[model samples]
Target: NLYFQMKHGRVFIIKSYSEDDIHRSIKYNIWCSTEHGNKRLDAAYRSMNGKGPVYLLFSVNGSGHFCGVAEMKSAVDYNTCAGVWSQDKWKGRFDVRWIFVKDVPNSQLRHIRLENNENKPVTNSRDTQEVPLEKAKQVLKIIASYK
Candidate 1:
């Protein structure tokens, strides 16, 4: 089966402007963004839809806290009235099944930070950006170790 063929794994870092945004996404089992935000979003869509077990790490914007992680269950789709996301700007969407973890500080994830970036230390600073699979796995393990 095609699904079973996804042996190579991947991880995407998704930015949420607010906690409500993430909650809405998790509740509806979807991720959303506007057409203008599709540069990295489109890339994530293409890669996630390819051969691999794609995982998503939802980060709270400006907080350095990851709300949860999930697997991308579907490819990208567009619908102005998707109704799940709280904003009109959030029309492009994808499906995910999230398992939340405790709110851990990103500063604690020092080893995986993108090097030499003065603006932000995290791997990516976009609405949707892909990080190395190994780094993502490391983050997952660290998060799991938290209470």
Candidate 2:
């Protein structure tokens, strides 16, 4: 939908926070909802501008999963998320930059690829997609960095 992951590829999902984003993710972060359009989420997914990177699987689209490994120093397009939740169709704005998130212990996070069926989606088609290339470097090495 956003980064091209509807029927394409590249683990994607980040719906969670009060008010119900309809309901999904764990830690480490990067959410660029392009459905509302922010000029192509700033365009420059080149590994956040270096070339190669992107893997997010945090959800409420249904069942659920966990995964986050991002990169985006500059080339910002939109990232003014305030009190997230049902973004009223993306007015809260999105396009996270610089991330090192990774949360999926119980589910044993690893090379994700979901769609186990859940139901209900007469509308709401979130965005952002594309994940491959050695599983986005094993989720950017399972993320790590704080301080």
Candidate 3:
């Protein structure tokens, strides 16, 4: 049985002053997924001019509902600093819910909370429940531009 139903997912853009801050945020990506039993990935990459890395984290529900979170890491290239996986493949068309929280203790570590709507009926169609690999990639492209 599905315990929670996600209604939407989205990503956020964040900036950090120190590399350590970024590393800490990127580390939370796996922790979030493991805590929720969801398949989510986070990547940190260099900006266009190598100024800094941009943290990109994303998650989606595969079974009962369509809901998840997208958090930006602090340092950008924190993946390299922390020696974590920095690349992933996700493509899809989804109703994304994005939010930006300011004045947080660590601005680089943006928070993306996933909410489940248990009242919504699960769709029977495969397309509705599972986002095709190709489509998920498209969605990732859209999310990547947030930086």
Candidate 4:
């Protein structure tokens, strides 16, 4: 299902704060979050249900740009990231290798946004959705520039 989509070069947008994403998970190379009964999160979980080399576009909530890129190193896991934040309410987890661009301020980065009906400028939030391939590449190019 979604595995086929990923295999064909799909890159998903993962929106969250630097605190949880850049600050905490970067240490362990694991991305953790709360499902909180949200069906969107459930779909996000389902979308990662493969032996993935899936790419992620990291966008910080409230920032006007894409923050970084990461490759999923592990499938969707559970209740991990133990003893690392204040507590473990954000139990939904995945392992990722990040190429952080947090040093670049939002204003200097590309002005990307969500697609479909909510085609608004990229801001801040806990969101996970599929990004258009072209837009994904724009972020990827920026990441490459750092290297």
Q: In order, what lDDT does every prediction score?
A: 0.66, 0.37, 0.27, 0.58
Q: How well is each residue in 22-127 modelled by candidate 4, as lDDT tens digits? A: 6666677877555642334445445756644457767666766666677766556664546555454566566788866554445543476656427754333246
Q: Write model 1 residue lDDT over 2-24, tens digit each, in one string.
A: 22222377666777777888777
User: Which candidate comes out best when scored by lDDT?
Assistant: 1
- Kindly report the root-mean-square deviation of model 3 from the true structure over all alpha carbons: 15.3
Question: Candidate 3, residues 1-147: lDDT per residue as tens digits?
Answer: 222222233322222223443343334542222211122223211132233222232222222222223333322221222223222222211112232211222112222211222322222221112333333334344333334
RMSD each, Å: 5.1, 14.6, 15.3, 5.6
Name the best candidate (by TM-score): 1
Candidate 2 vs candidate 4: the lDDT winner is 4
Each prediction's TM-score against the native?
0.75, 0.26, 0.21, 0.63
> Which portions of model 4 miss their true places by more than 4 Å?
1-7, 18-21, 36-52, 63-66, 79-83, 108-114, 123-126
TM-score of 4: 0.63
lDDT, model 2: 0.37
Q: Residue 77 in model 4: shift from native, Å? A: 1.5
The number of clashing residue pairs in each candidate reads: 0, 12, 13, 3
Could you tell me the lDDT of residue 45 within candidate 3? 19
